[PDB]
Point group: C3
Chain length 455, copies 3
C-alpha cells in the first residue's frame, strides 16, 4: 500500500494552471485525488541575460525558470510535453518526485514540432526540481531548462499572504561577465564549474529594483526556492532577516529560525518569511563573489511603518547593493544598442555611465563626485582629471596609488584596480564623469579603453 494511497482519481480531469516566475498557481484547494492534465511547451529563444547581453535560452514555457506546476499528493498526472517547431534541439523532462525510471525522460522525448505524453502518480509530497534530460544533459540544463513542481500535502500548505517562485542557476558564456553582445554557451567553463553569471530567474536584475518581490509589514511570505544548477550549491541566505522555516523537497525534517541554508544542485526548498520592519531584503548565494560579482541577488521589498525600537537604520543603498540599488539600468541597454547601430551619442554614454557609477565609484568618490577632502579625492571639477583626461582610463583599469594633489589638497592613498570592467563600461563611466559636476566635457570610447588595456 504505497505512500499517497488516496484512491483512484475522482471527478473530471483538471487542466493544470501553470504560472510564470516569480508567481505561483493558486492552491489546489481540494480534498480528493484528481487526474491532472499538464501541458508544457519547450521554446528556444534569445533573451537578455544582462543589459546589452543576449543569450539563447532553452525554456520550459518561455521562461527561466520554467512554468511552475502545482498538483496534490495522490494525483494522477498526465504530462504532455510539446517541442515548438522553431526548436533546433530535441528535449524531454525528468521531474523530481516522479516514481519511475528517468523521472519521465524516455517517454517524454520530443523532437521539434512534436508532442509526447506519459502518466505518473504523484506519490511524494514536496517541492521538486524538474529539468530537461536530453544528452548533453548539462548543456540543456545550463541553457535554462529547469523549473519547479509542487506536490501539495493532502491538507494543503498553511495559508500565507504571498507565494513566490525563485530559482538559482549557474550560466556559462564565452565572454566575460557583462561583455556585451550575443554570448554563446561555453562548454569548457561549464565542465570546469566556472560560471560567468550566477542568477535568480534567468537574468541579472530579474528580481531587483523595479522587479522586486513585494509584501507589507506583518505579512507572511512563502518562497519556493529552486537550484537548477547545473553545478553550483547555493549558500542561500536572506540579508537582514531570518527564515521562520526551511523545508527541503518533501522531507519530514523542518528547520526553523535560520538565515543561511545550503541548497544542493538540483535541490529545492520552501522557505517562510515574516515581514517585521520595512525595507529591502536580499536573497543571495552567500558564496559572496556570486552574489556581488556574478548577479546572484534578488529583492523582497517590504513596505510599512518603521519601528525604531527594532531597527533604527536606513534602507539598503548602493554602498551594499551597488548598481542594483536603482530601479533599473535601462540606460546601459540603450547605450549598447546605440553602439551596435553606430548611433552612440555622448548623452547615451553619460546615462549609461550614471547607472554604472552607483556603488562601483560612488562608494568612495560619492554620488555627487565630491569625495571627502584629504581621504577620497573629488571627481567634481577635478583639476587632476582635467589636466590629463585620458589618464583616467589607466586609473580605472590599473588603479592609482602614491602622493597626488587634487584641488589643492594632498592625497596619499590607494584606489584599487578595476580591470574586470569591460571597455564599454570604463568608456561610459568616464564619459559620465567628464560631463558632470562642471567638468570639461568630451568623451572616452570603448576603443580608447581597448587600446589602453592592450598596453
Amino acid at each position: 500500500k504505497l505512500p499517497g494511497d488516496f484512491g483512484p482519481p475522482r471527478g473530471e480531469p483538471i487542466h493544470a494552471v501553470l504560472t510564470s516566475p516569480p508567481l505561483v498557481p493558486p492552491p489546489v484547494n481540494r480534498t480528493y485525488p484528481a487526474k491532472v492534465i499538464v501541458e508544457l511547451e519547450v521554446v528556444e529563444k534569445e533573451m537578455q541575460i544582462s543589459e546589452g547581453v543576449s543569450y539563447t535560452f532553452w525554456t520550459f514555457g518561455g521562461t527561466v525558470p520554467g512554468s511552475f506546476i502545482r498538483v496534490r499528493q495522490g494525483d494522477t498526472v498526465e504530462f504532455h510535453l510539446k517541442n515548438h517547431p522553431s526548436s533546433k534541439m530535441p528535449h524531454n523532462i525528468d521531474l523530481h518526485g516522479v516514481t519511475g525510471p528517468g523521472g519521465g525522460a524516455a517517454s517524454s522525448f520530443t523532437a521539434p514540432g512534436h508532442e509526447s505524453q506519459f502518466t505518473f502518480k504523484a506519490l511524494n509530497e514536496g517541492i521538486y526540481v524538474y529539468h530537461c534530460a536530453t544528452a548533453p544533459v548539462g548543456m540543456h540544463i545550463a541553457n535554462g531548462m529547469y523549473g519547479l513542481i509542487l506536490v501539495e500535502p493532502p491538507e494543503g500548505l498553511p495559508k500565507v499572504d504571498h507565494e513566490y517562485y525563485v530559482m538559482q542557476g549557474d550560466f556559462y558564456t564565452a565572454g566575460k561577465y557583462r561583455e556585451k553582445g550575443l554570448q554563446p554557451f561555453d562548454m569548457e567553463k561549464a565542465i570546469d564549474e566556472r560560471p560567468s553569471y550566477v542568477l535568480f530567474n534567468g537574468a541579472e536584475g530579474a528580481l531587483t529594483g523595479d522587479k522586486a518581490l513585494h509584501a507589507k509589514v506583518g505579512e507572511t511570505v512563502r518562497i519556493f526556492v529552486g537550484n537548477g544548477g547545473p553545478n553550483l550549491v547555493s549558500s542561500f541566505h536572506v540579508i537582514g532577516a531570518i527564515f521562520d522555516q526551511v523545508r527541503y523537497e518533501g522531507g519530514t525534517n523542518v528547520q526553523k529560525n535560520v538565515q543561511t541554508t545550503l541548497i544542493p544542485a538540483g535541490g529545492a526548498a520552501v522557505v517562510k518569511f515574516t515581514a517585521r520592519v520595512p525595507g529591502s531584503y536580499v536573497l543571495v548565494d552567500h558564496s559572496i563573489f556570486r552574489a556581488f560579482n556574478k548577479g546572484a541577488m534578488a529583492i523582497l521589498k517590504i513596505d510599512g511603518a518603521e519601528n525604531k525600537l527594532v531597527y533604527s537604520g536606513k534602507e539598503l543603498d548602493s554602498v551594499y547593493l551597488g548598481d542594483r540599488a536603482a530601479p533599473n539600468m535601462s540606460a546601459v541597454t540603450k547605450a549598447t544598442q546605440a553602439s551596435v547601430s553606430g548611433t552612440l551619442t555622448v548623452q547615451d554614454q553619460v546615462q549609461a555611465g550614471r547607472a554604472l557609477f552607483a556603488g562601483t565609484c560612488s562608494v568612495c568618490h560619492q554620488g555627487n563626485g565630491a569625495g571627502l577632502p584629504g581621504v577620497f579625492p573629488p571627481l567634481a571639477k577635478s583639476d587632476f582629471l582635467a589636466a590629463d583626461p585620458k589618464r583616467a582610463m589607466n586609473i580605472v583599469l590599473h588603479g592609482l596609488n602614491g602622493k597626488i594633489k587634487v584641488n589643492g589638497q594632498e592625497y596619499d592613498s590607494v584606489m584599487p584596480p578595476m580591470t574586470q570592467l569591460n571597455d564599454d563600461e570604463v568608456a561610459n563611466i568616464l564619459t559620465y564623469v567628464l560631463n558632470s559636476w562642471d567638468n570639461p566635457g568630451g568623451r572616452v570610447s570603448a576603443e580608447d579603453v581597448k587600446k589602453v588595456r592592450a598596453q
Copy 2:
C-alpha cells in the same frame, strides 16, 4: 561512563569479515561486545579508470573504495594494517569513528613489506569514512585510499532485502577525460579542485549496465554511501525515486522522504530505498557535469511487473544515460589495445564507434542514422557525408550550422561542436558511421583527427 559502555569484551576474538565493493559483510548479529581483529592490506596497482584508460591506484584491500569493515558499537577493535612489499609508498590509516589522535594514523604507519597494529574501542555507532593519513595526504586519498567502516548500533540495523556499498571520489589525471593510456596523478588539478573524473567505486561504469546493483519490486535496499573526496561535496541524488531515510554518520537526526542530499567531503550516509516500479534508478552527483560528463552515475536496476497506474513511461535509455545505457563499452577497450599493438582494424573501430555513438550522436541522428526529415539530417546513406567524408571531422569537432541539403531535403539548424571528444573517439565514431547503413566504407584515424584539430 563514556558512550558505548557495554562492558569488557566477552567470548573469543572474532576475525572481521571484510568485503569488496559493492557488497557488505553480514550483520554482526550479536548482543555482546567482542574483541574484533581486522586485517587490511594496502596494494598499489594499475586498474582501468575508464575504457582504455589506466591509472595507478593505491588501495585498501585491492579495491576502490577499500574493503568494507563491519563491527558493533562497544567492540574493541585490534586493527592490523599490512603494506604489500610491492608498494613504493608508506601508508597508514585514519578511521572516522575512532576516539584518539589521528584516528589511528601515527601507530598505523607502515612501510612497504611491514605490518602495524593499534587497538581502539568503537564508542560511536554510525557509518564512517576511513582513509590514508600519510603525507601528502591529498595525493594518497586522490589515488583511491578510502573506504567505509560501519559501527552498528547494539540492536543492529533493521533488516532489509539488500545492502550495498557505493562510494564517490574525485580523480585528477594529467590527461583529459577519456584520453587513453596510463594517466599520471595531476597535483595541479587536485590543488585546484578540478577533477577530470568523478566516479562511484573507482571507475567509469563501475555500477552501470551489466555491473548495476539489483533488487525487485517490493524490496528494501539499504546503501552505505561514502564520499571519499578528496575535495568534492556530492549533491547526491536518485533519479526517478526518493530515499525513505537518509542518516549521516552516527547522527541522531534522520531525514525521511528526500531525493537530493549533500554529502560532505569525507562524509558518509546510510540511505534506504523501497522499490516501487521496475526500471533503472540512477545514483548521481547532481552537480550535473559530474554526473554526465565525468562519470558520476551508478545504477540500481529493479526487476518486476510494471504498474501503469503509478508510472506509464518507458525504461531509461541512451537519450538520458548516453553511452552507459548499454551493458558495457568493451569494444572501446579492444580498439584502444589494438591501437597500442598497431593491430587496429576497421571493424575494431566500427565496434568502438558503435558504443560511443549511443546518446552522443543518436539523440539527434537516431540509432539507425535516419534522423528526422527536415529537422535532423540522416547519416544513413548521407550524400552530404559521402561527398566529402573528411569534412565530418570538422563537423564533429567544430559543429555545423547554416543551410545545407542532405538527401534532397533542406536543413537550416545547428549541430553544436563536440570538441571534448578525443581524437580516437572522433575517428572511431566516424569509422562506424562510414561503415553502417550502406555508407561508402573507409575509415578515419586518430591521427587524421589530430591534424584537423590542429588547424
Copy 3:
C-alpha cells in the same frame, strides 16, 4: 508580538565586552533585557598570513576573525563602528541576526577617521556571522572583514569548561601558496573561487603547535565556528573525535553525534566536544587539499592520562600533520627576513630547512635521514647525493624514478615530484640535508633552484 519580546531595556546600559580570537567574552549571566553599547573599530594592517608571507588585512578590531560580540536575545544593541584614520577604504557592517535592511549596512557606512551608529533589537537567538558590506563586498570580506556575534538564549547556554572562537576563511594572493613577501589581493582568483590559502583565524598555524587550543580529559569544550568565506563551504570535521552536538545559527534543529558537517559560506555553528583521551584533535575542512595543502587545520590539544582500553595509539605526528606537528616554524620567518636583508647564512637555511623537512621529506627518508634499506634510500651520508649535490634540485622539483644505487644498496622505486615547493623552500631543505648527518656541507640558494626550475 515579535520573537524576543522580553520587554523594554531595564537597568543601566552595558558596555559590551569584546574579545579577540580564539577567546570569547564571559556569558552575560542575566535575566533581563538590556541596552548594550558595542564599540568596534576597523583597522587595516599588514600581518603574517604564513611564515615570511605578509598580507594587508582589513580587520574588525585588529584581528581576523574580528572581535567576538556577545549579547542576549531581547537586548537593544547600540552599535558604534569607528574607522581608524589610517584606513584607506570606507567600511561598514552587516550583522547576521539583525532584523533590518542590510543588517546595519547603510547606517554604519564609515569613512576613514569617522564613526557611525545604528540601533537594533536582537530578536533572534543564535551564533551569527558579521562582515563588512562595502562595495566591492567580496574584496572586503576576502581581506578579513568578518567575525561572530552570539545572541544568547534568555536562559544562557549550558555551562562548559572552555569556550573557543574559530573561523574559516578563503584567501586570494597573487603569489602561490608559501611564496614569500608582501602578497597583494588577487581579484581574478577570488572571482574564480580559487583560493591560495584556506585558514582558521587568519594565518597558517594560527591554531597549531604552540598556538593550539587546550583542554583536559573529562572536560567539555564549546567552539563557536564561523565560515567567513567569502566563497568556500567547509566540510568541517574533527579528526579522531566526534561532536556531541552541532547547532547552526539559531536553528531549532540540533544534530548530535556527528564528525563531519557542512558549514555554508557566511554560516556559523556551535559545536560541543567532550574530551575522552589525550592527544591532538584536528579541526579541518575535509575538502582535503584545503586542510593539507592550503593551511586549513587547527588543533585542540587534550592533556591527561592515556586510556589504552579506548585507544592504544600514539599522538599525532608529522606523518599526518606534516610541518605543523612542531611547536612552530619561526626559523622560516628568520630565514626569509635574512634573505630580504641580504644577510642569509648557511645556518639560517639549515634551521629553515629543518622545519620544512618534517613530513614533507621525513615520511619516507625519516627524521634522521636513514631511510629504510632497499625501500627508501638514505639522505644521511648519501654517496648518491654527495656525487652530484646539484642534481638534488631536479630530484625535489621533478621527482626521481628508476634503478639507482645508494650506499651499496639497489633501489627501484618512485619519488614523486614536489614542484609546488617554492625556490627558497627547496634551497633551504637541501641546505639542511647537505649540512646534516655528516654530509659534505655547502648550500643551495633560492636562485640556484630558480635556474633549474627554468630549464
